[PDB]
Amino acid sequence: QLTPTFYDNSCPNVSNIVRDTIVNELRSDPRIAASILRLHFHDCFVNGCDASILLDNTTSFRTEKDAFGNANSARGFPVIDRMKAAVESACPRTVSCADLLTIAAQQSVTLAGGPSWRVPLGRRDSLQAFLDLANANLPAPFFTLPQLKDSFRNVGLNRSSDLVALSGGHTFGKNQCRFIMDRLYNFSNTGLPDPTLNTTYLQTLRGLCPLNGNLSALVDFDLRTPTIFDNKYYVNLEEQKGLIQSDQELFSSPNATDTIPLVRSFANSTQTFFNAFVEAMDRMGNITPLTGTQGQIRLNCRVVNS
Ligand code: HEM
Ligand SMILES: COc1cc(/C=C/C(=O)O)ccc1O
Ligand SMILES: [Ca+2]
Numbered sequence: 001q002l003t004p005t006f007y008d009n010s011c012p013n014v015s016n017i018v019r020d021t022i023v024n025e026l027r028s029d030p031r032i033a034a035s036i037l038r039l040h041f042h043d044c045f046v047n048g049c050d051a052s053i054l055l056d057n058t059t060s061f062r063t064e065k066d067a068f069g070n071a072n073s074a075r076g077f078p079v080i081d082r083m084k085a086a087v088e089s090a091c092p093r094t095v096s097c098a099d100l101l102t103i104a105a106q107q108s109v110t111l112a113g114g115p116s117w118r119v120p121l122g123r124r125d126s127l128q129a130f131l132d133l134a135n136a137n138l139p140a141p142f143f144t145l146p147q148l149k150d151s152f153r154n155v156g157l158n159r160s161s162d163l164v165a166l167s168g169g170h171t172f173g174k175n176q177c178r179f180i181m182d183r184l185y186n187f188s189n190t191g192l193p194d195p196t197l198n199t200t201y202l203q204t205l206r207g208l209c210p211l212n213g214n215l216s217a218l219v220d221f222d223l224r225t226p227t228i229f230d231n232k233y234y235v236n237l238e239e240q241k242g243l244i245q246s247d248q249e250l251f252s253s254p255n256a257t258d259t260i261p262l263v264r265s266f267a268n269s270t271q272t273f274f275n276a277f278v279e280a281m282d283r284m285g286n287i288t289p290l291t292g293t294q295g296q297i298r299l300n301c302r303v304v305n306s
């Protein structure tokens with residue numbers, strides 16, 4: 001069983017070292033907290049939270065970094081290397097990369113103004129990476145609500161509260177124009193914009209992402225508070241201002257009978273959202289972990305030991 005006190009004796013300062021690393025990085029890269037939370041999410045949705053995502057290429061298996069959901073998209077890997085080196089200096093061969101990334105995600109959320117809690121610990125590191133599984137398992141921004149639900153259920157998160165609450169991770173961070181071009185100019189081959197996108201916000205998005213423009217340009221997920229972890233993401237959805245298709249479907253999909261009340265509940269109360277986010281985060285963090293003597297305590301998160 002995973003437990004929050006796992007390193008209370010072996011590496012009591014692990015959480016603090018992780019925190020200090022993120023604080024320093026945030027001074028030069030204000031997007032890093034959002035980037036780290038996403039890394040943990042992509043780790044957990046592929047063979048569980050086993051740091052498989054941190055592995056680089058080898059001649060026997062391809063890195064998950066080349067998956068459609070990660071390539072020219074996932075970021076912050078060197079920052080994970082920095083805190084790992086610091087933790088290894090403070091407590092040699094003790095903290096797994098899987099647990100380190102889980103802590104980084106939680107500390108990232110707290111530093112951005114979100115809830116503060118102690119994550120269950122005790123996860124161990126995979127001995128391989130899973131590119132194909134990553135391409136099959138990571139949900140896409142163009143998914144319909146049924147597909148998003150199918151995506152979460154496939155990795156073990158059956159509750160609509162898991163989907164709605166974890167989607168709140170879009171209360172901060174960036175998204176490329178590439179992923180909303182269809183919503184802005186030709187949604188589902190209709191030759192028209194997505195009708196569930198607020199018309200006033202549509203004009204704004206079109207100015208940031210003009211047709212034939214730089215598809216890699218970045219746009220904020222939350223137009224209210226771009227870098228603050230709060231419940232404003234949900235207030236946006238209620239106004240048809242979710243950024244990507246998968247955001248707005250939580251509230252506008254014909255299959256959203258069960259998600260609509262959750263969106264409203266989280267938009268109405270910070271406390272309610274925060275509680276559900278912690279709950280959903282720990283459930284996602286509990287997806288098929290390697291524990292005990294399974295896997296290893298990777299010394300360099302990029303490669304398997306020796
Ligand atoms: C429900 C399905 C989800 C879909 C389809 C989705 C879609 C997206 C897309 C397309 C991006 C933009 C990437 C880019 O432009 O390079 C992204 C960014 C992000 N996502 Fe999600 N996501 C999902 C769930 C989540 C979850 C569960 C979390 C965390 C709990 C998360 C955290 C983030 C963060 C923080 C960013 C910004 C990262 C950065 O700015 O570096 N996402 N996601
Ligand atoms: C970031 O996530 C994704 C990106 C793509 C990109 C496809 C393309 O460029 O053709 C597809 C699916 C994803 O889940
Ligand atoms: Ca993984």
Ligand SMILES: [Ca+2]
Nearest residue numbers: 171222225228
């Ligand atoms: Ca916000």
